[PDB]
Amino acid sequence: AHAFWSTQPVPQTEDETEKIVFAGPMDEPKTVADIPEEPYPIASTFEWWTPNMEAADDIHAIYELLRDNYVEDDDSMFRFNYSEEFLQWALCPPNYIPDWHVAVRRKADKKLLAFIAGVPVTLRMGTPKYMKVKAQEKGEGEEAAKYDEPRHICEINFLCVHKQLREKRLAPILIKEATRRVNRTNVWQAVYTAGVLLPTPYASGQYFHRSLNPEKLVEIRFSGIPAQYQKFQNPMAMLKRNYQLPSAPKNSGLREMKPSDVPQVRRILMNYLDSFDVGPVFSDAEISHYLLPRDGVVFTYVVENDKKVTDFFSFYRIPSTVIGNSNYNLLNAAYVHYYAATSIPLHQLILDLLIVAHSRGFDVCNMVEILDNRSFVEQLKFGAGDGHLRYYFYNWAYPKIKPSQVALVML
Ligand SMILES: CCCCCCCCCCCCCC(=O)SCCNC(=O)CCNC(=O)[C@H](O)C(C)(C)COP(=O)(O)OP(=O)(O)OC[C@H]1O[C@@H](n2cnc3c(N)ncnc32)[C@H](O)[C@@H]1OP(=O)(O)O
Ligand SMILES: COc1cc(C)c(S(=O)(=O)Nc2c(C)nn(C)c2C)c(C)c1C
Ligand SMILES: [Cl-]
After folding, report:
1. Least packed by Cβ within 10 Å: which of 33, 64, 81, 147?
2. What's this protein's function (predicted)?
Protein backbone atom coordinates (compact mmCIF):
# COMPACT_ATOMS: atom_id res chain seq x y z
CA ALA A 1 0.00 0.00 0.00
CA HIS A 2 1.09 3.48 -0.99
CA ALA A 3 0.36 6.38 1.35
CA PHE A 4 1.31 8.83 -1.47
CA TRP A 5 0.36 7.18 -4.79
CA SER A 6 -3.02 6.15 -3.52
CA THR A 7 -3.81 9.92 -3.35
CA GLN A 8 -2.91 10.52 -7.05
CA PRO A 9 -4.66 10.37 -10.42
CA VAL A 10 -2.96 7.14 -11.65
CA PRO A 11 -4.37 3.64 -11.91
CA GLN A 12 -3.91 1.85 -8.56
CA THR A 13 -3.57 -1.84 -9.57
CA GLU A 14 -2.66 -4.07 -12.57
CA ASP A 15 -6.32 -4.97 -12.26
CA GLU A 16 -7.37 -1.41 -13.12
CA THR A 17 -5.06 -0.95 -16.15
CA GLU A 18 -5.80 -4.41 -17.57
CA LYS A 19 -9.46 -3.21 -17.71
CA ILE A 20 -8.87 0.21 -19.40
CA VAL A 21 -10.01 0.59 -23.00
CA PHE A 22 -9.72 4.19 -24.03
CA ALA A 23 -7.09 6.88 -23.54
CA GLY A 24 -8.23 9.80 -21.45
CA PRO A 25 -7.57 11.84 -18.28
CA MET A 26 -8.36 10.60 -14.76
CA ASP A 27 -8.80 13.71 -12.67
CA GLU A 28 -11.63 16.21 -12.58
CA PRO A 29 -10.95 18.88 -15.23
CA LYS A 30 -9.34 21.97 -13.70
CA THR A 31 -8.01 25.35 -14.65
CA VAL A 32 -4.83 27.23 -13.93
CA ALA A 33 -7.05 29.46 -11.71
CA ASP A 34 -7.82 26.39 -9.53
CA ILE A 35 -4.12 25.84 -8.84
CA PRO A 36 -2.48 27.42 -5.81
CA GLU A 37 -0.09 30.20 -6.77
CA GLU A 38 2.15 29.68 -3.68
CA PRO A 39 4.75 26.93 -3.65
CA TYR A 40 3.89 23.90 -1.59
CA PRO A 41 4.71 24.30 2.18
CA ILE A 42 7.96 22.73 3.32
CA ALA A 43 9.73 22.74 6.69
CA SER A 44 11.26 26.06 7.77
CA THR A 45 14.89 24.78 7.42
CA PHE A 46 14.51 24.11 3.70
CA GLU A 47 13.67 26.33 0.74
CA TRP A 48 12.56 25.78 -2.90
CA TRP A 49 15.13 26.75 -5.61
CA THR A 50 14.83 27.12 -9.37
CA PRO A 51 18.29 26.34 -10.78
CA ASN A 52 19.41 28.35 -13.76
CA MET A 53 20.47 25.77 -16.38
CA GLU A 54 22.68 28.26 -18.25
CA ALA A 55 24.64 28.81 -15.07
CA ALA A 56 27.64 26.40 -15.04
CA ASP A 57 27.65 26.51 -11.27
CA ASP A 58 23.95 25.60 -10.85
CA ILE A 59 24.40 22.74 -13.38
CA HIS A 60 27.45 21.71 -11.35
CA ALA A 61 25.52 21.64 -8.08
CA ILE A 62 22.93 19.38 -9.77
CA TYR A 63 25.76 17.30 -11.31
CA GLU A 64 27.27 16.65 -7.87
CA LEU A 65 23.94 15.75 -6.31
CA LEU A 66 23.30 13.24 -9.09
CA ARG A 67 26.88 11.88 -9.07
CA ASP A 68 26.58 11.00 -5.37
CA ASN A 69 22.84 10.20 -5.03
CA TYR A 70 21.15 9.26 -8.30
CA VAL A 71 20.29 5.80 -9.78
CA GLU A 72 22.14 2.74 -8.45
CA ASP A 73 21.71 -0.81 -9.50
CA ASP A 74 20.16 -3.21 -6.94
CA ASP A 75 23.60 -4.53 -5.89
CA SER A 76 25.08 -1.05 -5.46
CA MET A 77 27.93 -1.73 -7.95
CA PHE A 78 27.13 1.16 -10.39
CA ARG A 79 25.67 4.64 -10.14
CA PHE A 80 25.01 7.04 -13.05
CA ASN A 81 27.47 9.88 -13.51
CA TYR A 82 25.66 12.08 -16.00
CA SER A 83 28.01 14.74 -17.16
CA GLU A 84 27.34 18.51 -16.86
CA GLU A 85 27.14 18.93 -20.62
CA PHE A 86 24.64 16.02 -20.73
CA LEU A 87 22.55 17.72 -18.00
CA GLN A 88 22.48 21.01 -19.87
CA TRP A 89 21.44 19.20 -23.09
CA ALA A 90 18.73 17.14 -21.38
CA LEU A 91 17.30 19.94 -19.21
CA CYS A 92 17.28 22.74 -21.81
CA PRO A 93 15.54 21.57 -24.92
CA PRO A 94 13.83 24.17 -27.15
CA ASN A 95 11.02 26.04 -25.35
CA TYR A 96 11.82 24.51 -21.92
CA ILE A 97 10.12 26.18 -18.93
CA PRO A 98 12.79 26.96 -16.28
CA ASP A 99 10.09 26.81 -13.57
CA TRP A 100 9.75 23.07 -14.21
CA HIS A 101 13.19 22.47 -12.73
CA VAL A 102 12.58 21.99 -9.04
CA ALA A 103 15.11 21.81 -6.23
CA VAL A 104 15.09 21.79 -2.43
CA ARG A 105 18.03 23.53 -0.73
CA ARG A 106 19.00 23.86 2.89
CA LYS A 107 18.20 27.44 3.93
CA ALA A 108 21.44 27.85 5.96
CA ASP A 109 24.30 26.57 3.68
CA LYS A 110 22.32 26.32 0.37
CA LYS A 111 23.38 22.66 0.12
CA LEU A 112 21.30 21.02 -2.64
CA LEU A 113 19.32 18.13 -1.15
CA ALA A 114 16.67 17.09 -3.71
CA PHE A 115 15.79 17.67 -7.39
CA ILE A 116 13.23 16.81 -10.04
CA ALA A 117 12.97 18.03 -13.64
CA GLY A 118 10.22 18.35 -16.25
CA VAL A 119 10.83 19.20 -19.87
CA PRO A 120 8.07 19.70 -22.49
CA VAL A 121 7.27 16.92 -24.93
CA THR A 122 4.63 16.62 -27.68
CA LEU A 123 3.42 13.07 -27.35
CA ARG A 124 0.98 11.00 -29.37
CA MET A 125 -0.91 9.14 -26.61
CA GLY A 126 -4.40 8.29 -27.87
CA THR A 127 -6.06 4.91 -27.88
CA PRO A 128 -3.71 2.19 -29.17
CA LYS A 129 -4.54 0.57 -32.59
CA TYR A 130 -5.72 -2.86 -31.28
CA MET A 131 -8.16 -1.04 -28.94
CA LYS A 132 -9.38 1.25 -31.75
CA VAL A 133 -10.16 -1.99 -33.61
CA LYS A 134 -12.34 -3.32 -30.77
CA ALA A 135 -13.95 0.16 -30.64
CA GLN A 136 -15.09 -0.02 -34.29
CA GLU A 137 -16.42 -3.54 -33.74
CA LYS A 138 -18.42 -2.04 -30.79
CA GLY A 139 -19.67 1.26 -32.43
CA GLU A 140 -17.51 3.31 -29.95
CA GLY A 141 -14.99 4.72 -32.45
CA GLU A 142 -15.60 8.34 -31.50
CA GLU A 143 -14.89 7.76 -27.85
CA ALA A 144 -11.68 5.96 -28.89
CA ALA A 145 -10.40 8.74 -31.15
CA LYS A 146 -11.23 11.64 -28.88
CA TYR A 147 -7.60 12.18 -27.63
CA ASP A 148 -5.75 11.36 -30.84
CA GLU A 149 -4.14 14.76 -31.32
CA PRO A 150 -0.53 15.01 -30.09
CA ARG A 151 -0.54 16.60 -26.63
CA HIS A 152 1.92 19.08 -25.19
CA ILE A 153 2.67 17.48 -21.85
CA CYS A 154 5.57 17.23 -19.37
CA GLU A 155 8.32 14.65 -19.32
CA ILE A 156 9.67 13.98 -15.87
CA ASN A 157 13.22 12.83 -15.04
CA PHE A 158 16.11 13.18 -12.56
CA LEU A 159 14.12 12.74 -9.38
CA CYS A 160 16.71 12.41 -6.66
CA VAL A 161 16.76 12.76 -2.91
CA HIS A 162 20.09 13.09 -1.10
CA LYS A 163 21.18 9.88 0.70
CA GLN A 164 20.95 11.48 4.18
CA LEU A 165 17.37 12.54 3.57
CA ARG A 166 15.88 9.23 2.36
CA GLU A 167 12.68 7.69 3.68
CA LYS A 168 11.61 11.07 5.12
CA ARG A 169 8.68 11.58 2.70
CA LEU A 170 10.45 14.33 0.79
CA ALA A 171 9.93 12.70 -2.68
CA PRO A 172 6.08 13.11 -2.48
CA ILE A 173 6.53 16.82 -1.72
CA LEU A 174 8.88 17.29 -4.71
CA ILE A 175 6.36 15.53 -6.89
CA LYS A 176 3.41 17.72 -5.66
CA GLU A 177 5.38 20.90 -6.25
CA ALA A 178 6.49 19.82 -9.73
CA THR A 179 2.83 18.91 -10.40
CA ARG A 180 1.81 22.42 -9.25
CA ARG A 181 4.34 24.29 -11.43
CA VAL A 182 3.29 22.21 -14.47
CA ASN A 183 -0.48 22.62 -13.89
CA ARG A 184 0.19 26.36 -13.49
CA THR A 185 1.32 26.30 -17.11
CA ASN A 186 -1.92 24.53 -18.19
CA VAL A 187 -0.41 21.06 -18.61
CA TRP A 188 -2.37 18.20 -16.97
CA GLN A 189 -0.53 14.98 -18.00
CA ALA A 190 3.07 13.81 -17.54
CA VAL A 191 5.05 10.80 -18.80
CA TYR A 192 7.84 9.21 -16.72
CA THR A 193 9.86 6.01 -16.46
CA ALA A 194 11.38 4.05 -13.59
CA GLY A 195 13.50 0.99 -12.81
CA VAL A 196 11.01 0.13 -10.00
CA LEU A 197 7.38 -0.93 -9.96
CA LEU A 198 4.99 1.81 -9.02
CA PRO A 199 1.29 2.18 -9.63
CA THR A 200 0.83 1.56 -12.49
CA PRO A 201 2.84 0.99 -15.69
CA TYR A 202 1.26 0.95 -19.15
CA ALA A 203 4.33 -0.75 -20.58
CA SER A 204 7.38 -2.57 -19.38
CA GLY A 205 10.51 -3.38 -21.32
CA GLN A 206 13.58 -5.42 -20.49
CA TYR A 207 17.14 -4.09 -20.71
CA PHE A 208 19.63 -5.45 -23.21
CA HIS A 209 23.42 -5.05 -23.28
CA ARG A 210 26.06 -5.50 -25.93
CA SER A 211 29.60 -5.95 -24.72
CA LEU A 212 32.15 -3.85 -26.52
CA ASN A 213 34.88 -4.34 -23.87
CA PRO A 214 34.20 -7.79 -22.30
CA GLU A 215 37.45 -8.02 -20.31
CA LYS A 216 36.64 -4.78 -18.41
CA LEU A 217 32.94 -5.76 -18.09
CA VAL A 218 33.85 -9.12 -16.45
CA GLU A 219 36.49 -7.49 -14.18
CA ILE A 220 33.89 -4.98 -12.77
CA ARG A 221 31.15 -7.66 -12.67
CA PHE A 222 28.80 -6.04 -15.06
CA SER A 223 29.04 -9.42 -16.90
CA GLY A 224 29.52 -13.08 -15.99
CA ILE A 225 31.61 -15.65 -17.88
CA PRO A 226 29.07 -18.36 -18.81
CA ALA A 227 29.71 -21.87 -17.46
CA GLN A 228 30.09 -23.19 -21.06
CA TYR A 229 33.25 -21.02 -21.20
CA GLN A 230 34.92 -23.05 -18.44
CA LYS A 231 35.04 -26.19 -20.65
CA PHE A 232 37.40 -24.01 -22.78
CA GLN A 233 41.18 -23.68 -22.36
CA ASN A 234 41.47 -19.89 -22.03
CA PRO A 235 38.03 -18.41 -21.08
CA MET A 236 38.99 -14.74 -21.66
CA ALA A 237 40.49 -14.95 -25.19
CA MET A 238 37.31 -16.77 -26.35
CA LEU A 239 35.08 -14.01 -24.89
CA LYS A 240 37.13 -11.21 -26.45
CA ARG A 241 37.10 -13.09 -29.79
CA ASN A 242 33.36 -13.60 -29.60
CA TYR A 243 32.50 -9.87 -29.17
CA GLN A 244 35.09 -8.46 -31.54
CA LEU A 245 34.05 -5.85 -34.13
CA PRO A 246 35.43 -4.17 -37.34
CA SER A 247 37.29 -0.93 -36.72
CA ALA A 248 35.52 0.90 -39.48
CA PRO A 249 31.79 1.10 -40.36
CA LYS A 250 30.50 -1.06 -43.26
CA ASN A 251 27.89 1.23 -44.84
CA SER A 252 29.52 3.39 -47.53
CA GLY A 253 28.34 6.95 -47.17
CA LEU A 254 27.97 6.87 -43.37
CA ARG A 255 29.01 10.17 -41.84
CA GLU A 256 28.03 12.33 -38.82
CA MET A 257 24.83 14.32 -39.02
CA LYS A 258 25.18 18.03 -39.94
CA PRO A 259 22.59 20.93 -39.55
CA SER A 260 21.50 20.64 -43.21
CA ASP A 261 20.34 17.03 -42.57
CA VAL A 262 17.65 18.23 -40.04
CA PRO A 263 14.59 18.23 -42.35
CA GLN A 264 15.28 14.82 -43.95
CA VAL A 265 16.08 13.21 -40.55
CA ARG A 266 12.90 14.74 -39.14
CA ARG A 267 10.89 13.36 -42.06
CA ILE A 268 12.33 9.82 -41.92
CA LEU A 269 12.05 9.71 -38.08
CA MET A 270 8.47 10.98 -38.03
CA ASN A 271 7.38 8.44 -40.67
CA TYR A 272 8.91 5.65 -38.62
CA LEU A 273 7.67 6.88 -35.18
CA ASP A 274 4.17 7.20 -36.60
CA SER A 275 3.72 3.45 -36.60
CA PHE A 276 3.95 3.20 -32.76
CA ASP A 277 1.01 3.73 -30.35
CA VAL A 278 3.02 5.97 -27.98
CA GLY A 279 5.67 8.24 -29.46
CA PRO A 280 6.99 11.76 -29.58
CA VAL A 281 6.48 14.40 -32.36
CA PHE A 282 9.53 16.57 -32.95
CA SER A 283 9.94 19.94 -34.74
CA ASP A 284 13.14 20.90 -36.73
CA ALA A 285 14.54 22.67 -33.66
CA GLU A 286 13.92 19.54 -31.51
CA ILE A 287 15.54 17.34 -34.15
CA SER A 288 18.61 19.64 -34.06
CA HIS A 289 18.68 19.82 -30.29
CA TYR A 290 18.13 16.07 -29.64
CA LEU A 291 20.18 14.63 -32.50
CA LEU A 292 22.97 17.00 -33.80
CA PRO A 293 26.36 15.78 -32.47
CA ARG A 294 27.65 17.32 -29.20
CA ASP A 295 30.97 15.91 -27.96
CA GLY A 296 30.79 13.49 -24.98
CA VAL A 297 26.95 13.59 -25.17
CA VAL A 298 25.14 12.51 -28.35
CA PHE A 299 26.53 10.86 -31.49
CA THR A 300 24.50 10.69 -34.68
CA TYR A 301 25.22 9.25 -38.06
CA VAL A 302 23.34 9.29 -41.29
CA VAL A 303 23.46 7.18 -44.40
CA GLU A 304 23.55 9.55 -47.32
CA ASN A 305 23.34 8.27 -50.80
CA ASP A 306 22.85 10.58 -53.78
CA LYS A 307 22.60 13.64 -51.57
CA LYS A 308 19.62 11.87 -49.86
CA VAL A 309 19.58 10.84 -46.19
CA THR A 310 17.94 7.42 -46.27
CA ASP A 311 19.04 6.03 -42.86
CA PHE A 312 20.32 7.35 -39.50
CA PHE A 313 21.15 6.26 -36.02
CA SER A 314 22.04 7.95 -32.75
CA PHE A 315 23.30 7.02 -29.30
CA TYR A 316 24.04 8.98 -26.16
CA ARG A 317 26.67 8.53 -23.40
CA ILE A 318 26.06 7.90 -19.78
CA PRO A 319 29.11 6.85 -17.80
CA SER A 320 28.43 4.98 -14.55
CA THR A 321 30.60 5.16 -11.46
CA VAL A 322 32.02 1.77 -10.56
CA ILE A 323 31.45 1.80 -6.82
CA GLY A 324 33.48 -1.07 -5.28
CA ASN A 325 36.22 -1.73 -7.89
CA SER A 326 39.09 0.74 -7.38
CA ASN A 327 41.01 -0.18 -10.61
CA TYR A 328 38.28 1.56 -12.67
CA ASN A 329 36.51 4.81 -12.09
CA LEU A 330 33.84 4.44 -14.81
CA LEU A 331 31.82 2.17 -17.04
CA ASN A 332 31.51 4.06 -20.34
CA ALA A 333 28.00 3.13 -21.67
CA ALA A 334 26.41 4.06 -25.06
CA TYR A 335 22.58 4.06 -25.12
CA VAL A 336 20.71 3.39 -28.30
CA HIS A 337 18.80 6.65 -29.04
CA TYR A 338 16.45 7.24 -32.09
CA TYR A 339 17.08 5.78 -35.52
CA ALA A 340 15.25 5.00 -38.78
CA ALA A 341 16.19 2.63 -41.62
CA THR A 342 14.67 2.83 -45.12
CA SER A 343 17.43 1.43 -47.38
CA ILE A 344 19.07 -1.39 -45.39
CA PRO A 345 18.14 -3.95 -42.78
CA LEU A 346 18.06 -2.49 -39.26
CA HIS A 347 20.71 -5.00 -38.04
CA GLN A 348 22.99 -3.69 -40.73
CA LEU A 349 22.39 -0.14 -39.63
CA ILE A 350 22.88 -0.87 -35.96
CA LEU A 351 26.09 -2.90 -36.52
CA ASP A 352 27.61 0.37 -37.52
CA LEU A 353 26.34 1.85 -34.20
CA LEU A 354 28.29 -0.87 -32.31
CA ILE A 355 31.38 -0.31 -34.47
CA VAL A 356 31.43 3.42 -33.94
CA ALA A 357 30.64 3.09 -30.21
CA HIS A 358 33.54 0.61 -29.80
CA SER A 359 36.10 2.61 -31.80
CA ARG A 360 35.28 5.69 -29.64
CA GLY A 361 36.09 3.76 -26.46
CA PHE A 362 32.68 2.77 -25.07
CA ASP A 363 32.55 -0.36 -22.89
CA VAL A 364 28.94 -1.50 -23.57
CA CYS A 365 25.94 -0.61 -25.60
CA ASN A 366 22.65 -0.53 -23.70
CA MET A 367 18.97 -0.30 -24.74
CA VAL A 368 15.44 -1.16 -23.67
CA GLU A 369 13.29 -3.43 -25.93
CA ILE A 370 11.18 -0.51 -27.32
CA LEU A 371 10.94 0.57 -30.97
CA ASP A 372 12.16 -2.32 -33.13
CA ASN A 373 15.10 -3.04 -30.78
CA ARG A 374 14.14 -6.77 -30.52
CA SER A 375 14.78 -7.24 -34.26
CA PHE A 376 18.56 -7.03 -33.96
CA VAL A 377 19.21 -8.64 -30.51
CA GLU A 378 20.45 -12.09 -31.54
CA GLN A 379 22.38 -11.14 -34.69
CA LEU A 380 24.20 -8.29 -32.93
CA LYS A 381 24.78 -10.43 -29.79
CA PHE A 382 22.85 -8.33 -27.22
CA GLY A 383 21.94 -10.29 -24.06
CA ALA A 384 18.97 -9.56 -21.77
CA GLY A 385 19.87 -7.87 -18.49
CA ASP A 386 18.10 -8.23 -15.18
CA GLY A 387 16.43 -4.78 -15.21
CA HIS A 388 13.15 -3.47 -16.57
CA LEU A 389 12.20 0.08 -17.52
CA ARG A 390 8.47 0.72 -16.77
CA TYR A 391 6.64 3.44 -18.55
CA TYR A 392 4.05 5.56 -16.69
CA PHE A 393 1.53 8.29 -17.26
CA TYR A 394 0.41 10.85 -14.71
CA ASN A 395 -3.35 11.69 -14.96
CA TRP A 396 -3.91 9.52 -18.10
CA ALA A 397 -5.87 6.26 -18.39
CA TYR A 398 -3.99 4.06 -20.85
CA PRO A 399 -4.47 0.32 -21.66
CA LYS A 400 -1.55 -2.12 -21.26
CA ILE A 401 0.66 -2.24 -24.40
CA LYS A 402 3.74 -4.12 -25.41
CA PRO A 403 7.07 -2.27 -25.17
CA SER A 404 7.47 -2.70 -28.97
CA GLN A 405 4.55 -0.26 -29.31
CA VAL A 406 6.54 2.48 -27.46
CA ALA A 407 8.70 4.91 -29.44
CA LEU A 408 9.72 7.37 -26.65
CA VAL A 409 13.40 7.04 -25.59
CA MET A 410 14.15 8.33 -22.02
CA LEU A 411 17.43 10.09 -21.19
C1 LIG B 1 0.93 17.20 -14.58
C2 LIG B 1 2.43 17.05 -14.25
C3 LIG B 1 2.70 15.87 -13.30
C4 LIG B 1 4.12 15.97 -12.68
C5 LIG B 1 4.49 14.76 -11.81
C6 LIG B 1 4.44 13.44 -12.56
C7 LIG B 1 4.79 12.25 -11.65
C8 LIG B 1 6.30 12.19 -11.41
C9 LIG B 1 6.66 10.97 -10.55
C10 LIG B 1 8.18 10.83 -10.39
C11 LIG B 1 8.89 10.28 -11.63
C12 LIG B 1 10.38 9.95 -11.37
C13 LIG B 1 11.08 9.37 -12.61
C14 LIG B 1 12.54 9.07 -12.22
O15 LIG B 1 13.36 9.99 -12.09
S16 LIG B 1 13.03 7.48 -11.91
C17 LIG B 1 14.61 7.63 -11.05
C18 LIG B 1 14.36 7.88 -9.56
N19 LIG B 1 15.58 8.29 -8.88
C20 LIG B 1 16.41 7.47 -8.21
O21 LIG B 1 16.16 6.28 -8.09
C22 LIG B 1 17.65 8.05 -7.54
C23 LIG B 1 17.97 7.24 -6.25
N24 LIG B 1 16.81 7.31 -5.35
C25 LIG B 1 16.34 8.40 -4.69
O26 LIG B 1 16.82 9.52 -4.81
C27 LIG B 1 15.14 8.27 -3.79
O28 LIG B 1 15.06 6.91 -3.31
C29 LIG B 1 13.81 8.60 -4.52
C30 LIG B 1 13.68 10.08 -4.86
C31 LIG B 1 13.66 7.77 -5.82
C32 LIG B 1 12.71 8.22 -3.54
O33 LIG B 1 12.94 8.94 -2.34
P34 LIG B 1 12.95 8.23 -0.87
O35 LIG B 1 13.41 6.83 -1.11
O36 LIG B 1 13.61 9.14 0.12
O37 LIG B 1 11.40 7.99 -0.47
P38 LIG B 1 10.43 9.06 0.25
O39 LIG B 1 10.11 8.55 1.64
O40 LIG B 1 10.94 10.43 0.05
O41 LIG B 1 9.10 8.82 -0.59
C42 LIG B 1 8.46 7.54 -0.56
C43 LIG B 1 7.44 7.52 -1.70
O44 LIG B 1 8.11 7.69 -2.95
C45 LIG B 1 7.69 6.72 -3.89
N46 LIG B 1 8.81 6.40 -4.81
C47 LIG B 1 9.88 5.63 -4.60
N48 LIG B 1 10.62 5.60 -5.76
C49 LIG B 1 10.01 6.38 -6.69
C50 LIG B 1 10.22 6.73 -8.03
N51 LIG B 1 11.28 6.35 -8.77
N52 LIG B 1 9.33 7.53 -8.65
C53 LIG B 1 8.25 7.99 -8.02
N54 LIG B 1 8.00 7.64 -6.76
C55 LIG B 1 8.86 6.86 -6.07
C56 LIG B 1 7.40 5.53 -3.00
O57 LIG B 1 6.60 4.55 -3.66
C58 LIG B 1 6.75 6.20 -1.82
O59 LIG B 1 5.42 6.51 -2.11
P60 LIG B 1 4.24 5.65 -1.42
O61 LIG B 1 4.49 4.22 -1.85
O62 LIG B 1 4.43 5.96 0.06
O63 LIG B 1 2.96 6.10 -2.08
C1 LIG C 1 16.53 2.86 -15.22
O2 LIG C 1 16.83 1.56 -14.67
C3 LIG C 1 17.95 0.83 -15.08
C4 LIG C 1 18.92 1.37 -15.91
C5 LIG C 1 20.05 0.64 -16.30
C6 LIG C 1 21.04 1.32 -17.21
C7 LIG C 1 20.28 -0.64 -15.84
S8 LIG C 1 21.65 -1.46 -16.24
O9 LIG C 1 22.28 -1.12 -17.48
O10 LIG C 1 21.25 -2.84 -16.37
N11 LIG C 1 22.81 -1.26 -15.06
C12 LIG C 1 23.27 -0.05 -14.57
C13 LIG C 1 24.44 0.63 -14.97
C14 LIG C 1 25.51 0.28 -15.96
N15 LIG C 1 24.48 1.80 -14.28
N16 LIG C 1 23.36 1.86 -13.43
C17 LIG C 1 23.30 3.07 -12.58
C18 LIG C 1 22.57 0.77 -13.54
C19 LIG C 1 21.27 0.55 -12.82
C20 LIG C 1 19.30 -1.18 -14.98
C21 LIG C 1 19.41 -2.57 -14.39
C22 LIG C 1 18.15 -0.46 -14.61
C23 LIG C 1 17.11 -1.07 -13.70
CL1 LIG D 1 18.11 4.74 -18.90
Report:
1. 33
2. Adds a myristoyl group to the N-terminal glycine residue of certain cellular proteins.
